[PDB]
């Protein structure tokens, strides 16, 4: 194996490769949303900015995992990035509800990875998950839930969506 | 008795200790409200910041009473701090109405303390009450009154509550 | 359940509510000590400043748990804050011994909470406990242990207590 | 009467002239103490500085009363300023105990003058006494009481007195 590899189970190596793909998909989904909200018939620049940054953040998460794979002596194997499940995301609220579901899907995958790492007695990998991923994921989920509540209070359609969009800008 | 005590009736000493507890309880109530408004299903950050600052202020009022007790040679007697009357505070308006009632309750207590101090010929204590508490208390009640009127004008539910929350943040 | 809740066991939510109350109690104890040391017949301003800071920090610890509860979609339940276990804390050494006892009690509670979190496979919570509480608690205990040893060397009564008080101011 | 005189009773005017003399007498006491502690066979420069400052503040208190007399249209009547009955003040502790007694004597006089002003329905004069004198008097008494306690802790003779003196420099 690698001259560096130590206490790194092939199962964790495989799950990290799966997670790289999932973070890249999430980046792609938020990229889709970002430009959906820049359509002339949608025109929600705060939502667009929010999801642009989210797409950037998820691709950075993916790259941290790739760096981690190399750090531990595993081999990055990239897989096809799936097309986003939708081409058009509906209302601001529906996009937020889709994002909340995706963040929780990612969170479940991260927790299943953490279970794999713990089961193989890899505390270097549990630390990575805990400090660089699971922490941000709970914060992102809380943030999106907050936004869902706020938009439902303001609107969620019409003038309330227009005003809520301004808080994201 | 204390080497510093002079013209300090035991009834005023005891009333100060009751007021310390009342200030600490008000701080607790506003701390409860502050974090209620940060629930993911409430998400009113302006209401949260307002009540956080109110909680800090009330704790400061308690400490000023404790400092005063020591200054006069009285002895601080601390008691349990009661649970807040509610765990869920409802709408922003209902929370403001609760706060208005609590401020007027505290105002009543302070005015009764002033009567005790006045009946015992303690001008140092009537000065404290007038300058450090009764003035602040009337200003707070007026503020909360204004806020209730503004929120009723804005909403008090839906978009108007969303927009009012912005002026507190 | 909350729209954000995920992998958050009801026993962990309940234990966090218990811990919030314990941190608020610890804040209350140090607040009592702080103003005990400002009595005209005690007059230890360094002790007073130390326990004033300790009280603020414990109140901050409680608020971080409250923020955490909301982040995970649990619901804050606030209870009565018991009166501090004394009204008069004796010598500087006796108050530090009492503070040591309390810090270790709080540590035991946090370690029990970590066991609850660990047993329910909640690494977000074990991370919070390790990084935001357990680390600080061990530093706190060591600091107080050092101070007890220093005061016993200096005094613990008379000129030694007077001189030691100056290193905390 | 004076073109400015309004709601100013002759008993209040008389008591203010009496109080002026008491403040000048207090200033003289503290001047006596100040230079006693600079004797080569006493050599307590911290005590000397403290009592020098105290002497200056009592003289300022007398001048504020003289200014007040003029403001109300009363006429200042100045009398002999008695020397202290005791000028061999003894130890630092003995001087602090004498200062505490003097401070409480002045306070009792101020409180009697408040009663006179209140009985003659003079709110301008009660305001003066509460804000310019009674407030500072309680703060002065608390400070000297604190010092007596610290000095007893430190010493009150020998090394502890030498060290306590440094705190006042
Ligand atoms: Fe991610
Ligand atoms: Fe208050
Ligand atoms: Fe704590
Ligand atoms: Fe004076």
XYZ file of C-alpha atoms and ligand atoms in Angstrom:
680
model
C 0.000 0.000 0.000
C 0.984 3.613 0.566
C 4.185 4.420 2.382
C 1.940 6.556 4.625
C -1.052 4.262 5.191
C -1.651 3.321 8.829
C -4.836 2.204 10.604
C -6.880 3.022 7.463
C -9.520 0.414 6.664
C -10.498 -0.217 3.049
C -14.162 0.285 4.049
C -13.508 3.808 5.273
C -11.528 4.468 2.072
C -14.556 3.395 0.007
C -17.044 5.441 2.050
C -14.860 8.538 1.695
C -14.969 8.084 -2.084
C -18.767 7.802 -1.908
C -18.912 10.959 0.216
C -16.732 12.923 -2.212
C -19.298 12.082 -4.890
C -22.211 13.075 -2.657
C -20.700 16.459 -1.749
C -20.053 17.088 -5.448
C -23.678 16.252 -6.254
C -24.883 18.610 -3.516
C -22.627 21.303 -4.994
C -24.273 20.649 -8.362
C -27.791 20.824 -6.926
C -27.120 24.191 -5.315
C -25.481 25.390 -8.543
C -28.700 24.485 -10.357
C -30.797 26.338 -7.794
C -28.543 29.407 -7.873
C -29.059 30.014 -11.598
C -32.711 28.978 -11.455
C -33.209 32.008 -9.217
C -31.467 34.215 -11.801
C -34.008 33.447 -14.544
C -35.800 36.550 -15.778
C -39.107 34.934 -14.739
C -37.858 34.033 -11.241
C -35.585 36.975 -10.315
C -34.738 36.212 -6.658
C -31.159 37.487 -6.241
C -30.956 36.780 -2.515
C -31.893 33.139 -3.003
C -29.438 32.971 -5.901
C -26.601 34.367 -3.767
C -27.444 31.978 -0.932
C -27.297 28.924 -3.178
C -24.217 30.112 -5.059
C -22.356 30.210 -1.751
C -23.799 26.831 -0.766
C -22.544 25.327 -4.039
C -19.108 26.790 -3.352
C -19.165 25.417 0.208
C -20.082 21.869 -0.856
C -17.358 21.742 -3.507
C -14.900 22.849 -0.837
C -16.185 20.041 1.395
C -15.582 17.620 -1.466
C -12.017 18.842 -1.913
C -11.277 18.507 1.802
C -12.308 14.841 1.551
C -10.055 14.348 -1.474
C -7.194 15.907 0.474
C -8.088 13.595 3.377
C -8.036 10.499 1.156
C -4.504 11.393 0.012
C -3.417 12.271 3.554
C -4.288 8.737 4.744
C -2.840 6.893 1.748
C -6.111 5.879 0.104
C -6.907 6.355 -3.563
C -9.413 8.921 -4.824
C -11.800 7.297 -7.299
C -14.121 9.864 -8.845
C -17.578 8.885 -10.049
C -20.086 10.505 -12.380
C -21.869 13.469 -10.813
C -25.587 12.889 -11.234
C -27.804 15.465 -12.880
C -29.844 17.453 -10.355
C -33.168 15.819 -9.588
C -34.992 18.911 -10.940
C -34.294 21.473 -13.634
C -36.824 23.914 -12.136
C -37.252 24.250 -8.406
C -40.602 26.014 -7.982
C -41.113 28.653 -5.273
C -38.484 29.954 -2.885
C -40.101 27.803 -0.208
C -40.005 24.635 -2.320
C -36.303 25.182 -3.030
C -35.603 25.613 0.689
C -37.588 22.465 1.462
C -35.572 20.558 -1.146
C -32.329 21.938 0.330
C -33.385 20.912 3.847
C -33.994 17.363 2.619
C -30.613 17.279 0.872
C -28.758 18.605 3.915
C -30.370 15.896 6.057
C -29.533 13.209 3.463
C -25.903 14.339 3.528
C -26.030 14.381 7.328
C -27.270 10.786 7.427
C -24.483 9.757 5.060
C -21.923 11.523 7.257
C -23.251 9.765 10.362
C -23.105 6.385 8.601
C -19.495 7.187 7.704
C -18.820 8.077 11.353
C -20.273 4.724 12.395
C -17.996 2.977 9.878
C -14.952 4.850 11.221
C -15.848 4.087 14.857
C -16.490 0.421 14.054
C -12.974 0.239 12.585
C -11.414 2.140 15.513
C -10.270 5.071 13.370
C -10.306 8.118 15.672
C -8.466 10.229 13.109
C -11.454 9.831 10.820
C -14.082 10.362 13.554
C -12.305 13.617 14.442
C -12.401 14.726 10.797
C -16.109 13.972 10.529
C -16.950 15.602 13.857
C -14.946 18.807 13.409
C -15.052 19.500 9.655
C -18.424 18.039 8.590
C -20.951 17.092 11.271
C -20.596 20.472 12.995
C -21.235 22.534 9.857
C -24.044 20.205 8.809
C -26.069 20.789 11.976
C -25.507 24.544 11.597
C -26.646 24.473 7.951
C -29.759 22.465 8.837
C -30.649 24.876 11.645
C -30.079 27.810 9.284
C -32.343 26.419 6.566
C -35.080 25.522 9.030
C -34.931 29.083 10.386
C -35.265 30.407 6.836
C -38.244 28.142 6.139
C -40.013 29.447 9.240
C -39.217 33.077 8.372
C -40.429 32.763 4.777
C -43.632 31.022 5.872
C -44.187 33.915 8.278
C -43.445 36.618 5.694
C -45.190 34.957 2.758
C -44.357 32.386 1.551
C -45.606 33.841 -1.763
C -45.865 37.371 -3.102
C -44.612 40.392 -1.207
C -43.303 38.231 1.653
C -41.079 36.233 -0.698
C -39.871 39.481 -2.274
C -39.003 40.910 1.152
C -37.510 37.687 2.539
C -35.264 37.448 -0.537
C -33.809 40.829 0.457
C -32.577 39.456 3.788
C -30.387 36.942 1.909
C -28.800 39.566 -0.355
C -24.460 45.075 63.418
C -22.128 46.208 60.626
C -19.575 48.922 61.334
C -20.951 50.885 58.349
C -24.680 50.595 59.074
C -26.448 53.897 59.742
C -30.143 54.826 59.393
C -30.828 51.468 57.673
C -34.029 49.806 58.858
C -34.323 46.007 58.824
C -37.544 46.308 56.787
C -35.678 48.112 54.014
C -32.850 45.552 54.174
C -35.423 42.754 53.812
C -37.263 44.520 50.984
C -34.011 44.959 49.069
C -33.436 41.198 49.332
C -36.929 40.564 47.989
C -36.254 42.968 45.117
C -32.951 41.238 44.277
C -34.874 37.998 43.813
C -37.496 39.765 41.699
C -34.827 41.273 39.434
C -33.138 37.864 39.051
C -36.473 36.247 38.186
C -37.190 38.914 35.545
C -33.754 38.237 34.040
C -34.672 34.543 33.901
C -38.001 35.242 32.198
C -36.358 37.389 29.514
C -33.648 34.759 29.043
C -36.421 32.230 28.489
C -38.068 34.479 25.912
C -34.764 35.204 24.170
C -34.069 31.562 23.342
C -37.717 30.795 22.576
C -37.387 33.274 19.697
C -34.341 31.341 18.436
C -36.282 28.075 18.066
C -36.184 26.875 14.464
C -39.987 27.060 14.384
C -40.060 30.636 15.759
C -36.970 32.318 14.258
C -37.475 35.950 15.295
C -33.886 37.204 15.699
C -34.904 40.764 16.595
C -37.197 39.605 19.381
C -34.372 37.320 20.528
C -31.788 40.107 20.662
C -34.249 42.395 22.451
C -34.986 39.899 25.202
C -31.317 38.877 25.524
C -30.376 42.490 26.231
C -33.350 42.752 28.630
C -32.166 39.658 30.481
C -28.673 41.144 30.862
C -30.071 44.487 32.055
C -32.203 42.842 34.711
C -29.235 40.840 36.015
C -27.337 44.156 36.195
C -30.187 45.676 38.208
C -29.971 42.762 40.647
C -26.225 43.267 41.046
C -26.726 46.982 41.699
C -29.143 46.074 44.497
C -26.627 43.597 45.921
C -23.895 46.239 45.820
C -26.306 48.617 47.551
C -27.109 46.102 50.307
C -23.388 45.781 51.076
C -22.849 49.555 50.926
C -25.448 50.120 53.669
C -24.260 47.213 55.813
C -27.223 44.956 55.118
C -26.719 41.262 54.440
C -27.607 39.775 51.052
C -29.969 36.823 51.447
C -30.429 34.919 48.201
C -33.388 32.612 47.544
C -34.418 30.221 44.805
C -35.203 31.792 41.435
C -38.634 30.591 40.345
C -39.173 28.837 37.022
C -40.530 31.231 34.368
C -44.318 31.146 34.248
C -44.323 29.719 30.693
C -42.067 27.513 28.615
C -43.578 28.680 25.302
C -44.357 32.357 24.861
C -46.584 32.325 21.778
C -46.576 35.174 19.266
C -44.207 38.116 19.447
C -47.162 40.220 20.555
C -48.089 37.822 23.355
C -44.478 37.890 24.563
C -44.453 41.700 24.524
C -47.733 41.736 26.459
C -46.227 39.341 29.004
C -43.142 41.558 29.317
C -45.293 44.668 29.778
C -47.170 43.008 32.622
C -43.914 41.888 34.241
C -42.387 45.373 33.963
C -45.458 46.903 35.605
C -45.285 44.206 38.306
C -41.645 45.096 38.956
C -42.588 48.784 38.904
C -45.241 48.125 41.563
C -42.697 46.352 43.758
C -40.204 49.216 43.391
C -42.869 51.775 44.278
C -43.748 49.753 47.376
C -40.060 49.671 48.294
C -39.963 53.460 47.910
C -42.928 53.740 50.278
C -41.150 51.540 52.828
C -37.995 53.636 52.485
C -40.025 56.839 52.716
C -41.920 55.665 55.810
C -38.580 54.902 57.491
C -36.991 58.270 56.621
C -34.221 56.798 54.444
C -33.439 59.444 51.772
C -30.368 57.553 50.579
C -32.631 54.657 49.569
C -35.376 56.793 48.018
C -32.621 58.439 45.946
C -31.363 55.028 44.762
C -34.861 53.929 43.816
C -35.709 57.159 41.974
C -32.439 57.542 40.068
C -31.383 53.946 39.323
C -34.700 52.075 39.042
C -37.945 54.046 38.865
C -36.635 56.170 35.974
C -35.413 53.174 34.005
C -38.657 51.332 34.710
C -40.958 54.035 33.305
C -38.737 54.260 30.212
C -38.919 50.488 29.688
C -42.708 50.370 30.048
C -43.074 53.238 27.566
C -40.726 51.438 25.144
C -42.664 48.175 25.373
C -45.958 50.036 25.029
C -44.673 51.710 21.860
C -43.536 48.317 20.538
C -46.909 46.687 21.166
C -48.618 49.522 19.287
C -46.157 49.265 16.367
C -46.526 45.489 16.104
C -50.317 45.753 16.149
C -50.017 48.300 13.355
C -47.547 46.188 11.366
C -49.368 42.887 11.872
C -49.380 41.580 14.525
C -48.981 38.286 12.614
C -47.571 37.294 9.235
C -45.557 39.753 7.164
C -45.977 42.537 9.712
C -44.408 40.440 12.464
C -41.557 39.555 10.094
C -40.996 43.242 9.299
C -41.311 44.453 12.895
C -38.706 41.921 14.021
C -36.238 43.719 11.721
C -36.434 46.964 13.679
C -35.248 45.236 16.877
C -32.295 43.513 15.238
C -40.791 16.523 15.685
C -38.774 19.601 14.774
C -38.020 19.994 11.067
C -34.288 20.065 11.931
C -34.194 17.112 14.353
C -31.930 14.206 13.362
C -30.165 11.552 15.476
C -31.171 13.445 18.644
C -32.414 11.085 21.349
C -34.995 12.282 23.872
C -32.721 11.254 26.761
C -29.992 13.536 25.403
C -32.475 16.402 25.070
C -33.613 15.815 28.666
C -30.068 15.664 30.034
C -29.191 18.936 28.295
C -32.144 20.593 30.016
C -30.837 19.272 33.337
C -27.357 20.564 32.546
C -28.693 24.018 31.624
C -30.172 24.288 35.108
C -26.919 23.095 36.705
C -24.914 25.745 34.836
C -27.408 28.435 35.888
C -27.094 27.203 39.473
C -23.285 27.330 39.257
C -23.568 30.908 37.983
C -25.809 31.729 40.945
C -23.346 30.237 43.426
C -20.438 32.274 42.093
C -22.590 35.400 42.052
C -23.297 34.844 45.765
C -19.599 34.357 46.475
C -18.674 37.446 44.449
C -20.785 39.792 46.560
C -19.992 37.981 49.814
C -16.392 39.072 49.242
C -17.551 42.702 48.864
C -19.099 42.811 52.348
C -17.520 45.544 54.456
C -16.480 42.852 56.959
C -14.862 40.606 54.339
C -13.429 42.993 51.720
C -11.478 40.649 49.423
C -11.702 42.438 46.042
C -9.518 39.900 44.235
C -11.699 36.997 45.360
C -14.746 39.076 44.401
C -13.490 39.779 40.877
C -12.583 36.106 40.370
C -16.028 34.846 41.315
C -17.681 37.673 39.382
C -15.942 36.421 36.240
C -16.760 32.813 37.163
C -20.458 33.676 37.425
C -20.552 35.350 34.003
C -18.751 32.387 32.384
C -21.175 29.848 33.879
C -24.083 31.917 32.592
C -22.392 31.799 29.184
C -22.043 27.999 29.462
C -25.783 27.751 30.108
C -26.645 29.916 27.095
C -24.422 27.793 24.841
C -26.396 24.704 25.918
C -29.632 26.596 25.263
C -28.356 27.513 21.782
C -27.360 23.871 21.312
C -30.778 22.538 22.317
C -32.396 24.748 19.670
C -29.790 23.791 17.053
C -30.683 20.105 17.424
C -34.437 20.724 17.467
C -34.889 19.946 21.139
C -37.032 22.166 23.335
C -35.635 24.128 26.265
C -37.440 23.397 29.542
C -36.389 25.825 32.289
C -36.785 24.973 35.985
C -36.318 26.721 39.304
C -32.742 27.763 40.069
C -32.030 26.584 43.615
C -30.612 29.030 46.136
C -26.824 28.792 46.634
C -25.906 26.197 49.259
C -24.712 28.923 51.651
C -25.411 32.584 52.322
C -21.999 33.086 53.976
C -18.946 31.378 52.536
C -16.416 31.741 55.357
C -12.730 32.212 54.591
C -11.282 32.622 51.125
C -9.970 29.059 51.419
C -13.388 27.665 52.361
C -14.985 29.362 49.340
C -12.339 27.963 46.978
C -12.842 24.498 48.478
C -16.584 24.876 47.901
C -15.934 26.060 44.337
C -13.661 23.062 43.755
C -16.432 20.761 45.002
C -18.957 22.413 42.676
C -16.645 22.316 39.637
C -16.129 18.582 40.144
C -19.879 18.028 40.585
C -20.508 19.865 37.320
C -17.692 17.829 35.717
C -19.312 14.581 36.870
C -22.624 15.689 35.377
C -20.993 16.563 32.055
C -19.187 13.214 31.977
C -22.489 11.444 32.639
C -24.011 13.472 29.785
C -21.153 12.353 27.526
C -21.946 8.760 28.465
C -25.600 9.310 27.531
C -24.562 10.879 24.236
C -22.038 8.124 23.531
C -24.496 5.348 24.374
C -26.988 6.842 21.914
C -24.373 7.208 19.133
C -24.550 11.025 18.981
C -21.083 12.284 17.939
C -22.280 15.862 17.434
C -23.094 15.927 21.142
C -19.905 14.143 22.240
C -17.974 16.747 20.214
C -19.811 19.631 21.895
C -19.160 18.188 25.342
C -15.475 17.469 24.713
C -14.678 20.764 22.993
C -16.877 23.302 24.807
C -17.254 21.920 28.355
C -14.974 19.047 29.396
C -11.812 20.867 28.300
C -12.759 24.060 30.133
C -13.854 22.098 33.203
C -10.495 20.353 33.633
C -8.677 23.693 33.254
C -11.025 25.258 35.825
C -10.456 22.479 38.369
C -6.674 22.663 37.940
C -6.754 26.463 38.353
C -8.789 26.269 41.550
C -6.589 23.447 42.822
C -3.536 25.634 42.214
C -5.192 28.539 44.021
C -6.010 26.386 47.057
C -2.376 25.246 47.253
C -1.095 28.817 46.879
C -3.439 30.129 49.582
C -2.511 27.355 52.022
C 1.140 28.241 51.451
C 0.504 31.982 51.809
C -1.853 31.767 54.772
C -4.559 30.628 54.622
C -5.579 33.300 57.172
C -4.289 36.764 58.002
C -1.580 38.462 55.957
C -1.302 35.474 53.612
C -4.955 35.785 52.646
C -4.581 39.550 52.182
C -1.507 39.092 49.980
C -3.022 36.242 47.930
C -6.180 38.251 47.236
C -3.933 40.707 45.369
C -2.875 38.150 42.747
C -6.525 37.759 41.640
C -7.230 41.480 41.302
C -34.607 89.626 51.989
C -32.546 88.657 48.950
C -34.005 89.312 45.507
C -33.394 85.603 44.811
C -34.816 84.148 48.031
C -37.814 81.854 47.484
C -39.098 78.964 49.636
C -35.910 79.099 51.762
C -36.626 78.804 55.484
C -34.432 80.499 58.080
C -33.889 77.192 59.908
C -32.504 75.675 56.704
C -30.188 78.670 56.213
C -28.958 78.291 59.805
C -28.370 74.554 59.558
C -26.402 75.007 56.325
C -24.105 77.481 58.099
C -23.669 74.901 60.874
C -22.941 72.149 58.328
C -20.328 74.309 56.555
C -18.424 74.504 59.838
C -18.676 70.745 60.325
C -17.250 70.094 56.850
C -14.381 72.510 57.498
C -13.818 70.801 60.845
C -13.747 67.387 59.111
C -11.253 68.783 56.589
C -9.018 69.907 59.491
C -9.181 66.520 61.215
C -8.027 64.844 58.002
C -5.294 67.445 57.497
C -4.070 66.606 61.003
C -4.018 62.893 60.189
C -2.328 63.442 56.825
C 0.760 65.075 58.266
C 0.852 62.831 61.327
C 1.479 59.947 58.962
C 4.393 61.820 57.382
C 6.279 62.068 60.680
C 9.680 60.378 60.548
C 8.600 58.174 63.465
C 5.342 57.145 61.727
C 6.238 57.129 58.015
C 3.005 55.805 56.485
C 2.924 57.664 53.152
C -0.068 55.739 51.819
C -2.175 56.698 54.833
C -0.878 60.247 54.443
C -1.987 60.443 50.806
C -5.412 59.006 51.639
C -6.050 61.531 54.425
C -4.610 64.434 52.415
C -7.152 63.673 49.696
C -9.903 63.304 52.299
C -9.045 66.740 53.699
C -9.296 68.305 50.230
C -12.690 66.693 49.536
C -14.175 67.916 52.821
C -13.018 71.449 52.021
C -14.708 71.135 48.618
C -17.864 69.911 50.373
C -17.792 73.028 52.557
C -17.405 75.303 49.524
C -20.326 73.608 47.733
C -22.484 74.461 50.759
C -21.218 78.042 50.726
C -22.066 78.255 47.032
C -25.479 76.775 47.789
C -26.167 79.305 50.546
C -25.515 82.106 48.057
C -27.635 80.430 45.383
C -30.657 80.416 47.692
C -30.136 83.969 48.939
C -29.000 82.947 52.405
C -26.048 84.619 54.094
C -22.870 82.711 54.940
C -21.831 82.940 58.592
C -18.388 81.468 59.286
C -17.298 80.355 62.761
C -14.170 79.113 64.484
C -12.862 75.764 63.268
C -11.941 73.722 66.324
C -8.705 71.765 66.343
C -9.035 67.980 66.738
C -9.286 66.987 70.389
C -6.743 64.239 69.658
C -3.764 64.791 67.397
C -1.679 61.757 68.424
C -3.640 59.451 66.173
C -1.724 56.270 67.055
C -1.709 53.380 64.583
C -3.162 53.376 61.097
C -6.039 51.285 62.438
C -6.772 53.753 65.244
C -6.837 56.606 62.731
C -9.200 54.692 60.428
C -11.534 54.009 63.353
C -11.487 57.705 64.219
C -12.202 58.567 60.578
C -15.126 56.135 60.490
C -16.602 57.758 63.611
C -16.152 61.216 62.121
C -17.728 60.147 58.820
C -20.758 58.767 60.641
C -21.021 61.932 62.742
C -21.069 64.069 59.602
C -23.588 61.669 58.067
C -25.924 61.992 61.067
C -25.679 65.773 60.780
C -26.463 65.585 57.058
C -29.463 63.374 57.816
C -30.732 65.823 60.433
C -30.410 68.660 57.923
C -32.370 66.538 55.431
C -35.111 66.165 58.042
C -35.149 69.925 58.575
C -35.361 70.573 54.821
C -38.067 67.942 54.364
C -40.086 69.349 57.261
C -39.968 72.787 55.648
C -41.032 71.339 52.273
C -37.781 72.353 50.525
C -37.260 69.844 47.672
C -34.343 71.799 46.193
C -32.435 71.316 49.436
C -33.385 67.649 49.855
C -32.149 67.106 46.284
C -28.834 68.820 47.091
C -28.322 66.701 50.213
C -29.261 63.419 48.537
C -27.189 63.949 45.380
C -24.155 65.957 46.598
C -23.636 64.713 50.166
C -25.534 61.654 51.400
C -24.454 59.596 48.369
C -20.777 60.398 48.850
C -21.064 59.861 52.621
C -22.279 56.238 52.335
C -19.552 55.574 49.751
C -16.958 57.081 52.113
C -18.166 55.006 55.089
C -18.173 51.791 53.052
C -14.634 52.519 51.847
C -13.251 53.140 55.339
C -15.062 50.085 56.695
C -13.456 48.044 53.914
C -10.036 49.427 54.802
C -10.499 48.612 58.505
C -11.325 45.006 57.606
C -8.395 44.643 55.192
C -6.010 46.203 57.702
C -7.178 43.893 60.505
C -6.650 40.990 58.099
C -3.204 42.163 56.986
C -2.006 43.172 60.446
C -3.095 45.492 61.918
C 0.431 46.231 63.188
C 3.872 45.415 61.842
C 4.366 43.901 58.405
C 0.653 43.936 57.638
C 0.407 47.652 58.337
C 3.472 48.328 56.176
C 1.966 46.299 53.304
C -1.539 47.768 53.625
C -0.085 51.278 53.465
C 1.365 50.415 50.020
C -2.146 49.732 48.708
C -3.077 53.369 49.455
C -0.056 54.901 47.738
Fe -20.913 19.318 2.587
Fe -34.953 45.668 36.750
Fe -19.975 25.566 33.303
Fe -18.087 66.173 53.691
